[PDB]
């Protein structure tokens, strides 16, 4: 084989896709005879149904050349023959993350910014991006995605426990509450084996429970294991892994969502039928090998965009096939077909593409294998272009050529000063204006304001990564105190929070949990949001906060956003106030605010926050029945949101009022020691009603 007649190395890569599938999705009735069970076959050399005999045999002999060669001596020639070797992982934890860096650029930000078939993005940058990462070597894929999307992505991961488990603490960015691992049945106590039906169903239910029952925007799968001593049978030995990854795609990926999965050789009709099922289920499919995939191996990736509606029959069918596979382990039987060969070959376009892909990959891999062999037989040979190629690839993909090495062992005070970027520190010391009969007129605009129920004193919280979380009470004299709660948060995060005691049940059976309730956000994981509108900051807070949660680890402290109400709708708050018997109140019922779940807390009062800026105010047009913005200086009026009407964080914090709910204040009808000097619920509601018009 002449390996020196290979094309010149290049950072430019071309992609061709399968023809778009026109035939209908197979249903349960049609697939009822598709599964074929026969003798277990551990021979690959005759699988020429989608590849020429010459190419298959040549690639197999080229692989088997190294059956007698030293493994380390072979990998040392591999390092020299591969022109893309020096790329490695750059500043990530492994080279696998740079594979996602490669393919996210090649497929036009398909994963970091997923669109639909019409060109419309699925996630509003100014809603949350949901992704899943199954069969992941310490989540390098997720390291790339999280480093690129910061708090604007939430990831769900499942992988095999053991030496190749997730390494959250080694992510360049991110945290445990950004990429939340779930290991199947038992939650975090599972083994993460994706080939177990219990784990499949459990991870599916988990992902659906944390994605508004819609599913993830995309799923990435990169499963593999050692096939040492029997490398040539790699595709057969990992057939079930491939089937389970395709099935997980059909199980948790939302409609219009995407899916990328690592495969190996695709000579057998079993793997080709699986690819055909993906081609039927997605709007467009292709087989691609990035240059960050070593040229001498059988590794490639199948890229799928636009999951179709009504793929549930295929999902159930593949679940059943996996069960049969589990039942045939250690026997002489095996599932050798999932789609009949006549159906696959009946689609001439699909078969043409499949054969051409197999053969082109075979020729390239044969050249690379002979190249490694030649570099073994001659140790002076080398590619003199690895450095420049790596430089150009990093430039092309937008990956900065800077190492991970920055543990950011910053103290919370210095990091706080870094994150506020010269903003005056006294802004963080302002106390709220107490709401009294003398200050009631301050909330006169009503529409300019939002309100939320408080359960503890307001504090600032900074996240330095993982469990390095510190709080500060806003006074220059106070020290940053490490938070004694089992919770994690990404570095470069700055929050306005309160630490609430949540209660579930009453009396002797009452359980209590401490929780972080977010009031407002300034910086999350590195991008500043302080200048965005308050509702937008709360929505990005729900984005990150939904991301910073823990369903697989019931052992961790929950993080929540406060429920934000419109001031002209404060009446909805009092409907959630109940008198409940709290553990240790000697039987006295205490006022309790019940949240979205079956938990409640003792309220201390109600914050009123202004969301509209200086001489800008919101009125209600009775003719148009819509709210409008009015400029008190220019006298202009508009029904759209003016950019200068936006109240940034410092205005919202400085101008906030607090309506305390201590003794003598009646906000629930069962507690009427109404101190005549203190505002009741009726007084505030009457004032609000008089000034809504």
Q: Is 194 annotated as a binding residue?
A: yes
Give the containing element (helix H, strand E) for 221. strand 216-221
Is 212 tagged catalytic?
Answer: no
Token reading at 130: 């949901």
**Cβ–Cβ under 8 Å, residues 207 and 199:** no
Catalytic residue (one of 104, 133, 154, 222):
222
CA gap 488, 292 in Å, rounded: 32
Q: Are strands 129-134 and 216-221 parallel, antiparallel or unpaired?
A: parallel
Is 99 tagged catalytic?
Answer: yes
Distances (CA, A) of 636 to 394, 449, 492, 610, 633: 50, 21, 40, 20, 8
Residues 253-270 as b or e (16 or more Cβ within 10 Å = b): bbebbbbbbbbbbbbbbb
CA gap 256, 250 in Å, rounded: 12
Is 459 tagged catalytic?
Answer: no
Number of neighbouring beta carbons within 10 Å of residue 90: 20
Token reading at 438: 């003398």
Q: What is the resolution of this structure in A?
A: 4.0
Q: Is 138 annotated as a binding residue?
A: yes
C-alpha angle with apex 338: 337 to 340, nearest 5 degrees? 70
Catalytic residue (one of 149, 150, 262, 580):
262
Q: Is 67 annotated as a binding residue?
A: yes
Give the containing element (helix H, strand E) for 474. none
Token reading at 612: 């509209």
Question: Where do runs of H (alpha helix) occur along 210-311?
Answer: 234-237, 239-252, 269-281
Q: Give φ, ψ of 288 to 5 degrees.
A: -140, 140
Torsion over CA: 472, 473, 474, 479 (sign):
negative
Torsion over CA: 21, 22, 25, 26 (sign):
negative
Q: Is 65 annotated as a binding residue?
A: yes
Q: SS3 sequence, 596-637?
A: CCCCEECCCEEEEEECECCCEEEEEECCCCEEEEEECCCCCE
Q: Is 66 annotated as a binding residue?
A: yes
Token reading at 99: 């594979």
In residues, how long is the chain?
693
C-alpha angle with apex 366: 360 to 371, nearest 5 degrees? 130
Q: Is 664 annotated as a binding residue?
A: no
Q: Is 193 annotated as a binding residue?
A: yes
Q: Is 670 annotated as a binding residue?
A: no
Token reading at 635: 């006298």
**Cβ–Cβ under 8 Å, residues 667 and 591:** yes
Nearest alpha-carbon partner for 605 in 659, 532, 526, 528: 659
Nearest alpha-carbon partner for 134 in 41, 247, 232, 271: 247
Nearest alpha-carbon partner for 452 in 573, 544, 574: 573
Tokens 């708050």 identify what position? 573
Q: Please, which experimental method was used?
A: cryo-EM
Torsion over CA: 113, 119, 125, 129 (sign):
negative
Token reading at 543: 């984005």
Token reading at 204: 């599916």
Coil, strand, or helix at residue 486?
A: coil
Nearest alpha-carbon partner for 547 in 207, 188, 128: 128
Cα 292 off chain centre by? 23
**Cβ–Cβ under 8 Å, residues 317 and 34:** yes
CA gap 144, 101 in Å, rounded: 7
CA gap 581, 599 in Å, rounded: 13
Number of neighbouring beta carbons within 10 Å of residue 659: 25
Strands (E), 442-599: 449-454, 458-463, 469-472, 481-482, 493-504, 511-524, 527-528, 559-561, 565-566, 577-581, 589-594
Question: Exposed/middle/buried for 622, CB within 10 Å: 0-12, 13-18, 19+?
Answer: exposed
**Cβ–Cβ under 8 Å, residues 63 and 362:** no
Tokens 């006549």 identify what position? 342
Q: SS3 sequence, 75-144?
A: HHHHHHHCCCHHHCCCCCCCCHHHHHHHHHHHCCCCCCCCECCCCCECCCCCCCEEEEEECCCCCHHHHH
Q: Give φ, ψ of 235 to 5 degrees.
A: -60, -45
Report the half-sphere exposure of 277 (CA within 13 A, side-chain side): 31
Question: Where do runs of H (alpha helix) occur along 258-311?
Answer: 269-281
Q: Are strands 626-631 and 637-638 parallel, antiparallel or unpaired?
A: antiparallel
Coil, strand, or helix at residue 570?
A: coil
Q: Give φ, ψ of 386 to 5 degrees.
A: -65, -40
Catalytic residue (one of 99, 371, 415, 562):
99
Q: Is 233 annotated as a binding residue?
A: yes
CA gap 417, 476 in Å, rounded: 12
Q: Which residues contact 319 (CB under 8 A, 6 or more apart)?
A: 197, 200, 247, 251
SS3 content of the chain, % helix, strand, coil (to 5): 35, 20, 45
Token reading at 46: 């005759």
Tokens 């149904």 identify what position? 49
**Cβ–Cβ under 8 Å, residues 480 and 471:** yes
Nearest alpha-carbon partner for 530 in 609, 648, 611: 648
Q: Is 141 annotated as a binding residue?
A: yes
Q: Is 636 annotated as a binding residue?
A: no
Residues 61-81 as b or e (16 or more Cβ within 10 Å = b): ebbeebeeeeeeebeebbbbb
Coil, strand, or helix at residue 556?
A: coil
Question: Exposed/middle/buried for 212, CB within 10 Å: 0-12, 13-18, 19+?
Answer: exposed
Torsion over CA: 553, 555, 561, 563 (sign):
positive
**Cβ–Cβ under 8 Å, residues 452 and 519:** yes
Q: Give φ, ψ of 602 to 5 degrees.
A: -75, 120
């Amino acid at each position: 084989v002449d390996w020196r007649d290979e094309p010149e190395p290049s950072a430019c890569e071309q992609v061709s896709w399968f023809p778009e599938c026109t035939t209908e999705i197979p249903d349960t009735q049609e697939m009822s005879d598709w599964m074929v069970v026969g003798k277990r076959k551990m021979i690959i050399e005759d699988e020429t149904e989608f590849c020429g005999e010459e190419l298959l045999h040549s690639v197999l002999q080229c692989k088997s050349v190294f059956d007698v060669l030293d493994g380390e001596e072979m990998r040392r020639a591999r390092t020299r023959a591969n022109p893309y070797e020096m790329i490695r992982g750059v500043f990530f934890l492994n080279r696998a993350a740079m594979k996602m860096a490669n393919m996210d650029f090649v497929f036009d930000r398909m994963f970091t910014n997923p669109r639909d078939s019409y060109g419309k993005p699925l996630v509003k940058d100014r809603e949350l991006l949901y992704f899943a990462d199954v069969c992941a070597g310490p989540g390098g894929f997720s390291e790339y995605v999280l480093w690129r999307k910061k708090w604007h992505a939430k990831g769900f991961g499942m992988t095999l426990k053991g030496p190749n488990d997730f390494k959250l603490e080694d992510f360049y960015s991110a945290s445990s509450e950004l990429f939340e691992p779930y290991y199947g049945e038992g939650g975090i106590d599972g083994d993460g084996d994706i080939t177990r039906p219990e784990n499949i169903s459990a991870f599916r239910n988990f992902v659906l429970d944390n994605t508004d029952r819609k599913g993830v925007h995309f799923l990435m799968a990169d499963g593999g294991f050692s096939v040492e001593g029997q490398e040539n049978l790699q595709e057969i030995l990992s057939k079930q892994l491939l089937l389970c990854q395709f099935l997980m795609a059909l199980s948790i990926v939302r409609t219009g969502g995407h899916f990328i999965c690592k495969t190996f050789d695709l000579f057998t009709p079993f793997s080709v039928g699986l690819v055909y099922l993906l081609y039927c289920c997605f709007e467009r499919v292709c087989l691609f090998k990035p240059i960050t995939s070593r040229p001498a191996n059988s590794e490639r990736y199948v890229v799928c965009k636009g999951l179709k509606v009504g793929i549930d029959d295929v999902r159930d069918y593949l679940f059943a096939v996996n069960i049969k596979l589990n039942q045939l382990r250690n026997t002489d039987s095996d599932v050798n077909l999932v789609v009949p060969l006549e159906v696959i070959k009946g689609d001439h376009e699909f078969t043409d593409y499949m054969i051409r892909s197999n053969e082109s990959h075979c020729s390239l891999q044969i050249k690379a294998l002979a190249k490694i062999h030649a570099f073994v037989q001659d140790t002076t040979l080398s590619e003199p272009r690895q450095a420049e190629i790596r430089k150009e690839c990093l430039r092309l993909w937008g990956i900065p050529d800077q190492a991970r090495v920055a543990p950011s062992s910053s103290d919370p005070k210095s990091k706080f000063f870094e994150l506020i970027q010269g903003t005056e520190i006294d802004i963080f010391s302002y106390k709220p204006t107490l709401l009294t009969s003398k200050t009631l007129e301050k909330i006169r605009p009503v529409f300019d304001y939002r309100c939320m129920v408080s359960g503890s004193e307001q504090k600032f919280l900074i996240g330095l990564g993982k469990s390095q979380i510190y709080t500060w009470d806003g006074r220059q004299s106070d020290r940053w105190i490490k938070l004694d709660l089992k919770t994690e948060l990404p570095r470069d995060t700055l929050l306005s929070v309160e630490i609430v005691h949540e209660l579930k049940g009453e009396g002797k059976a009452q359980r209590k949990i401490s929780a972080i309730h977010i009031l407002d956000v300034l910086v999350l994981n590195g991008t500043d949001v302080r200048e965005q509108h308050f509702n937008q900051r709360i929505q990005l807070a729900e984005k990150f906060v939904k991301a910073v949660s823990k369903p697989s680890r019931p052992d961790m402290n929950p993080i929540r956003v406060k429920e934000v109400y419109r001031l002209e709708e404060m009446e909805k708050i009092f409907v959630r106030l109940e008198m409940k018997i709290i553990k240790g109140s000697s039987g006295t019922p205490k006022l309790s605010y019940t949240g979205r779940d079956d938990r409640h807390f003792v309220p201390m009062g109600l914050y009123i926050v202004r969301t509209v800026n200086e001489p800008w105010t919101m009125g209600f047009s009775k003719s148009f029945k819509k709210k409008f913005f009015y400029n008190k200086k220019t006298k202009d009026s508009t029904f759209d949101l003016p950019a200068d009407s936006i109240a940034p964080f410092h205005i919202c914090y400085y101008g906030r009022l607090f309506w305390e709910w201590g003794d003598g204040i009646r906000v629930h009808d069962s507690q009427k020691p109404q101190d005549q000097d203190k505002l009741s619920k009726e007084d505030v509601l009457s004032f609000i009603q008089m000034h809504r018009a």
